[PDB]
């Protein structure tokens, strides 16, 4: 019982690996390839920074 | 130093018969074994008749290696080495045409050495070396003809059920460290005279010492391990059930006579378990 | 002096990798063994041969070395185990070089007299390990590798903040251990830094929830288990705790102690208990290692110099008998071709003296008195019991589970009815055997002599937790 | 007076290439760049300022790096158009100017100087290379606009277009922000990073070597000159490292993966920006430039247009030395001991923690561990069984280059007490 529990533990860690992978390709999905997309994401980011500065 | 010799001879012999031993003619491992055991009894009885013996040596800090040979130790020593020797010679007889004569008498010497290590101890961890050691040699002999499945698992069960007891022994032993800090039976007894302290904890230590004793002397609930010790060669069963082993169950209490003589509850229970 | 003993296996490994042939690196590990032993005997004290050299003068990182009462045998132990790995071996990849490299690396690890250098070695040891893993065998090689490596690395990189924080928040001029200890961290500064040491140290110990990498690592290396044997000498977490984590930021450990003792206990019990269910040598030895480490850590965490000395000792010796069991397992592999426990039963009649060798090793493992395990296990029991008795107790339904798994394995591998029959013993395996038995017997019979250097360190760094 | 050498060779070769075979022009441009670097060594500890133009320890180190990158990238390119050298020359001077001044407007002009000729270097003319070039120019000119209005607002809050002027409250804050925008974009910090994946994948590989080394170098050089506040620094770092590594996980392609990775790396270097140590940063970029230059030289020896991750595999068997070197590059870019990449990372992290910014440092470090996935996913990928893959095994030029670069890497991993003694004043 404790053995299988441990196996399952290992599998859950794999779960985190895949969560970071997934999050990653969401972030990689953030880039569509359309230039207008990159431009809007751009201005967005910059306004975020200037907001942070105060 | 002479006191240690008694222990050393059926180790040196054990080591000859385990290491070589198959390099010996069929009588010889029996002859060696029985010979080293022969003058262990003899050469330790020389010590006993001379009034006593002592040994103190380097080990874990705070826990030196201390052997005390007195009346209580000597009585046991004579029983073990004498009857043990008789059983050695008998084993020279009953073991015949059986390969691993070497193995057998190696195991035999070894056993003798271990028991001598157990009963001569002025410190409980040395006593414990004795305990686990004798449990081990029992394991080893009980499975002597290994080609049989039934006489394998026997010894396994032995050393497991028994290690429950050894765990009790360890725990109780840790209990009297935090408490006193000696762990040498003589000074541990001389430290237990007077008012004592924290009686609940002392009773616990003695109770775990007993939880060990139950395993070693085959009382209830750990009773179950002994019947299956039939598996080994008969003189092994002779050595375990009479002259060695279970007797140490009693002896641990007897050296601890100081400890239990002040514990009414525990002793009541001991008698109850004895009766049952 | 020290640095030579540190460097000797490192060079020999290179000479094995590119260099030819295989055989020389064996006597290389032997030489390391002899010198490390030589430094072990003739030791003057804490300083031994001191070493200081500029590394980044402006940063404050210097090469700082010496042998403690601790660093000491660990040179001997590691040198030994790895030497056996060299000789009995049979991985013989020309990565016995990767091994000697790893040995030397660990030697450098223990000798580090300053934090950042220690850090450097700590991270460096990873590479051969991954290599002798990756390119030297296993089917699931790459995923097991990412497991072991990423566990260690995710643990590791944050600690640099603590090693910086240890220097920077304490205003220590350099990374020198002496200096760092001379400037203690305050409350809820020492807290964060100790914690940051504690994660990286816990994951490499291992303790209970974080051990999940250990079974995959040991399975996929080259089956002789040279890579594995050296992997177990890489289990150094406890040493790092006692030497670094606790003394630099003890105030946090005061809070964490209950939890650490608990985890040590549960690691021990769970380890030995789960070990039972194991169907192969790699996994079995893994969980067993987990139990032992549980015990050691239990010893250290209690304060109480008794338990601590027990912990470090148990560590040192268990490197040896575990690494030994690994090499031995591999050697029976090469002759058989399988690491499975159930199949191929008869051995004992067939194998003349192996039953004795493997038995000796296993007896050392279950912590039988007279062999290496018991002194550490026992002293540990004492100290653990001093701090938290309950956790000593839970941790000590260990011996039962330990004897269980060990005896089950030994019986089913050796004692029963004949198979075909097996190869007797190799000439490497003989040196391996005898040397092993010698080590185990000597550390078991005279736990006094070894660990005398452990004793001052034990009680002083225990009182470090006092007033 | 390295500037002298640069302007001279560029202007001269312009007309000379009419009379010279393109190879003769290659020989020329190569010679010029190497000579400029020579003048850089002979001036170590000789810092020199003329106009808004100023050469100091920083200019010295960072243009040492940049010049190195330019030489390596020209080494590979054998196209029989003399301009495909000329443009590189131009760009190089432009980067030198960028690192060499505090004048916001001269900085602007320098930015155009370095950036315009790379747009043209983006064309192998492969259909992607035009898309890449396009995105690059549009986003680039946008950032031009920003850095310019920034200079105008700096001149706004204070009497000068030169950096270091005393500075106001909110308007000054705003102005420093508007400088930070362009200067940040040029360094591939997130979330300004979007171009990076597309352009590295789109442009011909050797050119990308040039960019990914020289450009990042010059950009951090000019960045140190700016006064940037802790909170913003925190943001940029966090985003760069997170999105960089995470999205790099998603990468199936070597160049693009390397782009995202390089976003994470800009993220790491930005920590040095907390104290702006520059002995530390100088070192970091030394290590990084060597490793990356190496990596892209190898990616060039695979294919100019695109390299997938598998292509990297079995590289050890094919050429042992290149496999090993690529491995080392992956580890130095991972920031693992005992490599110079570890000391660069450490020096940045050290300056970071020295500044007492903890959470940021931690995140950076954690996701830096995340990066090991793909860094080993390449470095080890070297040893797998080779699949069908294009391989052109170089001149002695490339073999000796890549191996030299690696050796320089690990040398300073063990002995930074060689160069680090003077990344400072130059002792």
Curated annotation (Swiss-Prot), chain A:
The chain crosses the membrane at residues 33-53. It comes from the Bacteria. It is found in: Cell inner membrane. NDH-1 shuttles electrons from NADH, via FMN and iron-sulfur (Fe-S) centers, to quinones in the respiratory chain. The immediate electron acceptor for the enzyme in this species is menaquinone. Couples the redox reaction to proton translocation (for every two electrons transferred, four hydrogen ions are translocated across the cytoplasmic membrane), and thus conserves the redox energy in a proton gradient required for the synthesis of ATP. Belongs to the complex I subunit 5 family. NDH-1 is composed of 15 different subunits, Nqo1 to Nqo15. The complex has a L-shaped structure, with the hydrophobic arm (subunits Nqo7, Nqo8 and Nqo10 to Nqo14) embedded in the membrane and the hydrophilic peripheral arm (subunits Nqo1 to Nqo6, Nqo9 and Nqo15) protruding into the bacterial cytoplasm. The hydrophilic domain contains all the redox centers. This is NADH-quinone oxidoreductase subunit 12.
UniProtKB/Swiss-Prot annotation, chain C:
It comes from the Bacteria. Keywords: Cell inner membrane, Cell membrane, Membrane, NAD, Quinone, Translocase, Transmembrane, Transmembrane helix. Its EC number is 7.1.1.-. The keyword Cell inner membrane applies. One of its GO terms (biological process) is ATP synthesis coupled electron transport. It is found in: Cell inner membrane. It is a multi-pass membrane protein. The chain crosses the membrane at residues 1-21, 23-43, 47-67, 69-89, 91-111, 115-135, 144-164, 190-210, 258-278, 284-304, 308-328, 354-374, 390-410, 430-450. It catalyses: a quinone + NADH + 5 H(+)(in) = a quinol + NAD(+) + 4 H(+)(out). GO terms for molecular function: NADH dehydrogenase (ubiquinone) activity; ubiquinone binding. One of its GO terms (cellular component) is plasma membrane. NDH-1 is composed of 15 different subunits, Nqo1 to Nqo15. The complex has a L-shaped structure, with the hydrophobic arm (subunits Nqo7, Nqo8 and Nqo10 to Nqo14) embedded in the membrane and the hydrophilic peripheral arm (subunits Nqo1 to Nqo6, Nqo9 and Nqo15) protruding into the bacterial cytoplasm. The hydrophilic domain contains all the redox centers. NDH-1 shuttles electrons from NADH, via FMN and iron-sulfur (Fe-S) centers, to quinones in the respiratory chain. The immediate electron acceptor for the enzyme in this species is menaquinone. Couples the redox reaction to proton translocation (for every two electrons transferred, four hydrogen ions are translocated across the cytoplasmic membrane), and thus conserves the redox energy in a proton gradient required for the synthesis of ATP. Belongs to the complex I subunit 4 family. PANTHER family: NADH-UBIQUINONE OXIDOREDUCTASE CHAIN 4 (PTHR43507:SF1). This is NADH-quinone oxidoreductase subunit 13. It comes from Thermus thermophilus (strain ATCC 27634 / DSM 579 / HB8). The lineage of its organism: Bacteria, Thermotogati, Deinococcota, Deinococci, Thermales.
Curated annotation (Swiss-Prot), chain D:
The chain crosses the membrane at residues 1-21, 30-50, 57-77, 79-99, 104-124, 137-157, 172-192, 204-224, 230-250, 257-277, 280-300, 322-342, 360-380, 400-420. GO terms for cellular component: plasma membrane. It is found in: Cell inner membrane. One of its GO terms (molecular function) is NADH dehydrogenase (ubiquinone) activity. It catalyses: a quinone + NADH + 5 H(+)(in) = a quinol + NAD(+) + 4 H(+)(out). Belongs to the complex I subunit 2 family. This is NADH-quinone oxidoreductase subunit 14. It comes from Thermus thermophilus (strain ATCC 27634 / DSM 579 / HB8). The gene is nqo14.
């Amino acid at each position: 019982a404790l053995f299988y529990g441990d196996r399952g533990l290992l599998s859950g860690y794999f779960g985190l690996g895949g969560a970071a992978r997934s999050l990653g390709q969401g972030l990689a999905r953030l880039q569509t390839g359309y230039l207008r997309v990159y431009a809007l994401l751009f201005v967005l980011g910059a306004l975020l920074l200037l907001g942070v500065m105060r | 130093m002479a006191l240690l010799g008694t222990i050393l001879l059926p180790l040196l012999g054990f080591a000859l018969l385990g290491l070589f031993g198959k390099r010996m003619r069929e009588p010889l491992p029996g002859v060696l074994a029985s010979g080293l055991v022969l003058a262990s009894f003899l050469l330790g009885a020389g010590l006993l008749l001379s009034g006593g013996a002592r040994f103190q040596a380097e080990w874990l800090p705070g826990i030196p290696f201390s052997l005390l040979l007195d009346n209580l130790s000597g009585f046991m020593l004579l029983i073990v080495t004498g009857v043990g020797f008789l059983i050695h010679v008998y084993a020279i007889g009953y073991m015949g045409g059986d390969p691993g004569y070497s193995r057998f008498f190696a195991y035999f010497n070894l056993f003798i050495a271990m028991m001598l290590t157990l009963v001569l101890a002025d410190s409980y961890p040395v006593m414990f070396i004795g305990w686990e050691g004798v449990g081990l040699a029992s394991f080893l002999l009980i499975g002597f003809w290994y080609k049989n499945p039934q006489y394998a698992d026997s010894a396994r069960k032995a050393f497991i059920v028994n290690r429950i007891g050894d765990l009790g022994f360890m725990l109780g032993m840790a209990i009297l460290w935090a408490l006193y800090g000696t762990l040498s039976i003589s000074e541990l007894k001389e430290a237990m005279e007077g008012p004592l302290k924290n009686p609940d904890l002392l009773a616990l230590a003695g109770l775990l010492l007993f939880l060990g004793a139950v395993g070693k002397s085959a009382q209830i609930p750990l009773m179950v391990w002994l019947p299956d010790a039939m598996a080994g060669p008969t003189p092994v069963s002779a050595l375990i059930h009479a002259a060695t082993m279970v007797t140490a169950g009693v002896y641990l209490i007897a050296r601890s006579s100081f400890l239990y003589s002040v514990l009414p509850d525990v002793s009541y229970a001991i008698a109850v378990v004895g009766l049952l | 002096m020290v640095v030579l003993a540190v460097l000797l296996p490192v060079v020999f490994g290179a000479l094995l990798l590119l260099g030819l042939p295989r055989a020389l690196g064996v006597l290389g590990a032997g030489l390391s063994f002899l010198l490390n032993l030589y430094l072990f005997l003739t030791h003057p004290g804490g300083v031994a041969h001191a070493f200081q050299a500029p590394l980044l003068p402006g940063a404050g990182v210097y090469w700082a070395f010496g042998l403690d009462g601790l660093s000491a045998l660990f040179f001997l132990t590691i040198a030994l185990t790895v030497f056996l790995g060299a000789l009995v071996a049979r991985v013989e990849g020309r990565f016995l070089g990767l091994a000697l490299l790893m040995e030397g690396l660990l030697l450098g690890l223990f000798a580090a007299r300053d934090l950042l250098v220690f850090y450097v070695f700590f991270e460096a040891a990873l590479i051969p390990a991954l290599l002798m893993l990756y390119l030297y065998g296993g089917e699931g090689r790459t995923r097991a590798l990412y497991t072991f490596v990423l566990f260690t690395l995710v643990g590791s990189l944050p600690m640099l903040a603590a090693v910086l924080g240890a220097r920077l928040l304490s205003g220590s001029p350099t990374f020198l251990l002496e200096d760092l200890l001379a400037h203690p961290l305050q409350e809820e500064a020492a807290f964060w830094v100790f914690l940051g040491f504690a994660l990286a140290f816990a994951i490499k110990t291992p303790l209970f929830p974080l051990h999940a990498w250990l079974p995959p690592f040991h399975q996929e290396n080259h089956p002789s288990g040279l890579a594995d044997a050296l992997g177990t000498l890489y289990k150094v977490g406890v040493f790092a705790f006692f030497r670094f984590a606790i003394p630099l930021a003890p105030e946090g450990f005061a809070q964490a102690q209950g939890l650490l003792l608990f985890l040590a206990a549960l690691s021990a019990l769970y380890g030995a208990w789960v070990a039972f269910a194991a169907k192969d040598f790699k996994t079995l030895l893994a969980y067993a290692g987990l139990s032992h480490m549980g015990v050691a850590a239990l010893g250290v965490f209690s304060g109480t110099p008794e338990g601590a000395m027990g912990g470090l000792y148990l560590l040192a010796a268990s490197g040896v008998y575990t690494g030994g069991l690994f090499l031995l397992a591999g050697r029976l592999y090469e002759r058989t071709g399988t690491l499975e426990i159930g199949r191929y039963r008869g051995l004992a009649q067939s194998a003349p003296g192996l039953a004795a060798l493997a038995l000796i090793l296993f007896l050392a493992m279950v912590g039988l008195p007279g062999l290496s395990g018991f002194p550490g296990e026992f002293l540990t029991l004492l100290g653990a019991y001093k701090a938290s008795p309950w956790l000593a107790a839970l941790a000590f339904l260990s011996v039962i589970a330990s004897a269980a798994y060990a005896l089950t394995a030994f019986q089913k591998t050796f004692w029963e009815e004949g198979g075909s029959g097996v190869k007797d013993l190799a000439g490497a395996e003989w040196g391996f055997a005898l040397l092993s038995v010698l080590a185990l017997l000597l550390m078991g019979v005279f736990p006094g002599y070894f660990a005398r250097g452990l004793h001052p360190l034990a009680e002083a760094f225990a009182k470090l937790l006092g007033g | 007076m390295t500037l002298a050498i640069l302007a001279v060779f560029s202007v001269a070769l312009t007309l000379l290439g009419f009379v010279l075979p393109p190879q003769g022009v290659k020989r020329a441009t190569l010679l010029g760049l190497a000579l400029a670097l020579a003048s850089l060594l002979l001036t170590w500890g000789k810092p020199f300022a003329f106009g808004p133009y100023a050469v100091d320890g920083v200019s010295q180190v960072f243009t040492l790096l940049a010049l190195l990158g330019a030489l390596w990238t020209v080494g590979l390119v054998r196209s029989g158009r003399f301009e495909f050298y000329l443009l590189v020359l131009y760009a190089a001077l432009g980067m030198h100017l960028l690192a060499s001044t505090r004048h916001l407007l001269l900085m602007l002009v320098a930015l155009e100087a370095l950036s315009l000729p790379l747009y043209a270097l983006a064309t192998w003319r492969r259909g992607q290379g035009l898309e890449a070039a396009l995105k690059y120019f549009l986003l680039g000119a946008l950032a031009a606009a920003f850095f310019l209005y920034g200079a105008a607002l700096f001149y706004g809050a204070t009497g000068s277009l030169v950096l270091g002027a005393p500075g106001e409250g909110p308007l000054y804050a705003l102005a420093l922000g508007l400088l930070l925008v362009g200067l940040g974009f040029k360094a591939a910090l997130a979330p300004f990073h979007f171009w990076t994946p597309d352009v590295y994948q789109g442009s011909p590989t050797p050119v990308v070597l040039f960019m990914a080394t020289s450009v990042k170098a010059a950009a951090f050089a000019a960045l140190l000159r700016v006064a940037a506040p802790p909170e913003a620094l925190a943001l940029l770092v966090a985003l760069s490292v997170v999105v960089g590594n995470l999205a790099a996980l998603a990468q199936k392609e070597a160049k693009r993966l390397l782009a995202y990775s390089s976003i994470a790396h800009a993220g790491y270097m930005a920590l040095a920006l907390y104290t702006g140590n520059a002995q530390a940063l100088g070192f970091y970029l030394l290590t990084y430039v060597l490793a990356t230059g190496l990596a892209f030289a190898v990616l060039s020896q695979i294919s100019p247009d695109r390299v997938p991750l598998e292509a990297l595999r079995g590289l050890y068997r094919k050429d042992p030395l290149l496999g090993l070197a690529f491995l080392v590059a992956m580890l130095s870019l991972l920031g693992l001991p005992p490599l110079a990449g570890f000391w660069g990372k450490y020096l940045a992290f050290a300056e970071a923690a020295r500044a007492g910014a903890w959470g940021v440092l931690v995140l950076a470090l954690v996701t830096s561990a995340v990066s090991a996935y793909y860094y080993l996913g390449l470095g080890l990928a070297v040893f797998a069984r080779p699949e069908e893959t294009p391989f052109r095994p170089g001149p002695p030029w490339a073999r000796a280059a890549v191996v030299a670069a690696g050796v320089l890497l690990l040398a300073l991993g063990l002995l930074p007490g060689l160069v680090l003694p003077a990344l400072a004043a130059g002792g």
